[PDB]
Amino acid sequence: HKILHRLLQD
Amino acid sequence: KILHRLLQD
Amino acid sequence: SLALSLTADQMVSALLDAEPPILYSEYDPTRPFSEASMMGLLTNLADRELVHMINWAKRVPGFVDLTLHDQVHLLECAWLEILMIGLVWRSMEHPGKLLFAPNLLLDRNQGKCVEGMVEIFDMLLATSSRFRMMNLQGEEFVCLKSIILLNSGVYTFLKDHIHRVLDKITDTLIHLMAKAGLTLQQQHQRLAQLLLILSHIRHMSNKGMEHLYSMKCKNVVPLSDLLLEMLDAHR
Amino acid sequence: NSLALSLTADQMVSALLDAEPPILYSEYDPTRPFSEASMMGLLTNLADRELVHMINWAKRVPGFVDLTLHDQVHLLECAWLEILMIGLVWRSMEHPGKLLFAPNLLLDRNQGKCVEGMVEIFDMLLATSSRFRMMNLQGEEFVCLKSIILLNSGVYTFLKSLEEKDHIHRVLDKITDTLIHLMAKAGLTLQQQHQRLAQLLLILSHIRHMSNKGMEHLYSMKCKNVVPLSDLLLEMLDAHRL
Numbered sequence: 001h002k003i004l005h006r007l008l009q010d
Numbered sequence: 011k012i013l014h015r016l017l018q019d
Numbered sequence: 020s021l022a023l024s025l026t027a028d029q030m031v032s033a034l035l036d037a038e039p040p041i042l043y044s045e046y047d048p049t050r051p052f053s054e055a056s057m058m059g060l061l062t063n064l065a066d067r068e069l070v071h072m073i074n075w076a077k078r079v080p081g082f083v084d085l086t087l088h089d090q091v092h093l094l095e096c097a098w099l100e101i102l103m104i105g106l107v108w109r110s111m112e113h114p115g116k117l118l119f120a121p122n123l124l125l126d127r128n129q130g131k132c133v134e135g136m137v138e139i140f141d142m143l144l145a146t147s148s149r150f151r152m153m154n155l156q157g158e159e160f161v162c163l164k165s166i167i168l169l170n171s172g173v174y175t176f177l178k179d180h181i182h183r184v185l186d187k188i189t190d191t192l193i194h195l196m197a198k199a200g201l202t203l204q205q206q207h208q209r210l211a212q213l214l215l216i217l218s219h220i221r222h223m224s225n226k227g228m229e230h231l232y233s234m235k236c237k238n239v240v241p242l243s244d245l246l247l248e249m250l251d252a253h254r
Numbered sequence: 255n256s257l258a259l260s261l262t263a264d265q266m267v268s269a270l271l272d273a274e275p276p277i278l279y280s281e282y283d284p285t286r287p288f289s290e291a292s293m294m295g296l297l298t299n300l301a302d303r304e305l306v307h308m309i310n311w312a313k314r315v316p317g318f319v320d321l322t323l324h325d326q327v328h329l330l331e332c333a334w335l336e337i338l339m340i341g342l343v344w345r346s347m348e349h350p351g352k353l354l355f356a357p358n359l360l361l362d363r364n365q366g367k368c369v370e371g372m373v374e375i376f377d378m379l380l381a382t383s384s385r386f387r388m389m390n391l392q393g394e395e396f397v398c399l400k401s402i403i404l405l406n407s408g409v410y411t412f413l414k415s416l417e418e419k420d421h422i423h424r425v426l427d428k429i430t431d432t433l434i435h436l437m438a439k440a441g442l443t444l445q446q447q448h449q450r451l452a453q454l455l456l457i458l459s460h461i462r463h464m465s466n467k468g469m470e471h472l473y474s475m476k477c478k479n480v481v482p483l484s485d486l487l488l489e490m491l492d493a494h495r496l
């Protein structure tokens with residue numbers, strides 16, 4: 001669970 | 011300072 | 020796969036087009052700064068720049084080709100180097116100063132407010148002066164920044180594509196220098212000079228991380244959850 | 255005032271090869287596994303002796319003797335661990351999965367576990383070594399890289415009469431010339447030469463990274479009072495703190 005994960009998904 | 015010394019030589 | 024078919028000009032145009040915007044610091048005079056306030060401002064700024072870097076990265080030709088986890092690794096490894104080279108780049112026309120933002124131009128005396136920031140400040144300044152004396156072009160700068168992104172974490176994996184991409188960027192740098200009229204010798208000399216500066220940027224990043232961790236543990240100014248996550252990856 | 259600036263590529267290589275330090279042995283006496291305190295003592299002993307040779311090796315690096323004593327000291331204080339690391343990696347090249355600290359001291363990552371946190375640096379050293387092997391790094395190229403490290407790593411932290419930092423860049427530029435000369439000799443096209451040159455200089459960034467991480471662990475060593483570091487190592491180590 002990474003914020004970095006979300007920002008890269010978008 | 012050792013390095014200094016070793017270098018000096 | 021797409022990124023490898025691009026001509027040198029297409030690579031340069033793609034990289035220029037992807038450049039993130041220059042952000043402003045939270046306004047307000049109130050001079051001078053305290054350790055807390057300055058750290059407050061820089062933290063807020065760094066955090067917002069991060070968000071833009073993450074979207075700039077996706078526009079780095081061939082970066083999207085990588086799996087998610089590989090993208091995460093490179094970004095976690097290279098983020099502070101990337102902020103640093105950007106800070107140095109926009110500070111070039113301000114010798115003796117670091118332009119954190121158009122409304123936040125600082126000199127080293129101002130950086131002494133924060134514990135051991137002057138150390139890094141002086142290194143960043145030295146990097147800027149080095150860029151100025153070399154007359155670093157914007158086209159070269161963008162190549163350098165993507166190289167950092169693709170290279171810094173490449174050897175902490177377990178990568179062939181990434182290296183082919185790095186090669187593609189090397190060709191692009193040489194391509195640029197040739198246009199400037201530089202002779203063969205001048206071309207590889209400049210190439211090396213540029214790449215060697217990357218070693219110092221890496222050094223500044225490493226020293227920088229140690230200080231951020233110190234500030235965290237000190238808990239003087241709350242770091243954003245994003246910064247924290249990027250920081251913890253280096254420990 | 256002169257010297258290294260008047261050296262042909264071939265002459266550069268010759269001097270660099272001829273200046274190479276010897277491969278030292280460790281006091282490694284097998285029989286029983288023995289502890290982190292012993293392994294650290296072995297490595298510390300070895301590193302300390304290597305430093306003495308490195309110091310006299312630097313004197314033989316073209317252009318180095320042209321520097322002021324204070325500038326020679328600075329360069330080495332910044333670069334020593336990088337130079338030890340690239341050396342270790344080079345001699346470990348044809349030992350996949352192992353680091354050859356000494357001919358009688360070859361270790362895998364499992365044995366590195368013996369010391370807390372040393373495994374992390376171990377893996378990066380192996381990765382660098384694997385990279386060199388993949389690239390088929392040449393001895394002539396290695397010696398160029400090592401000298402580049404010596405001259406480059408401390409420069410951007412040197413002011414009125416600097417302008418002899420230009421002498422260092424002049425020398426660095428000739429070493430670059432040398433690298434190309436070598437590569438063109440091996441049958442590479444210009445494109446191939448520039449790419450390999452870049453690939454090699456990019457690895458230096460990673461070595462910088464390893465050194466920084468290593469320094470942090472070394473400093474940690476002393477304050478833990480674990481195994482006594484040599485006076486020379488403590489000196490060098492304090493340079494990367496004050």
Ligand SMILES: Cc1cc(O)ccc1C1=C(c2ccc(O)cc2C)[C@H]2[C@@H](S(=O)(=O)Oc3ccc(O)cc3)C[C@@H]1[S@@]2=O
Nearest residue numbers: 061062064065102103106133134135136139227230231
């Ligand atoms: C590079 C950079 C870009 C920005 O947009 C904003 C700040 C910075 C830098 C620093 C910084 C400060 C606070 C923060 O939350 C995040 C960053 C990245 C400091 C440093 S550092 O973070 O790399 O190292 C430190 C950190 C804390 C400290 O007290 C001293 C040095 C470089 C510049 S300024 O000198």
Ligand SMILES: Cc1cc(O)ccc1C1=C(c2ccc(O)cc2C)[C@H]2[C@@H](S(=O)(=O)Oc3ccc(O)cc3)C[C@@H]1[S@@]2=O
Nearest residue numbers: 297298300301304338339342369370371372468471472
């Ligand atoms: C690179 C190197 C060359 C040598 O000739 C001998 C040792 C080493 C390294 C290490 C080392 C160990 C003890 C010492 O007094 C000095 C050094 C440089 C260790 C590490 S380190 O010292 O750079 O980092 C450490 C230090 C302590 C620790 O507990 C874990 C990692 C790299 C290699 S081995 O993995």
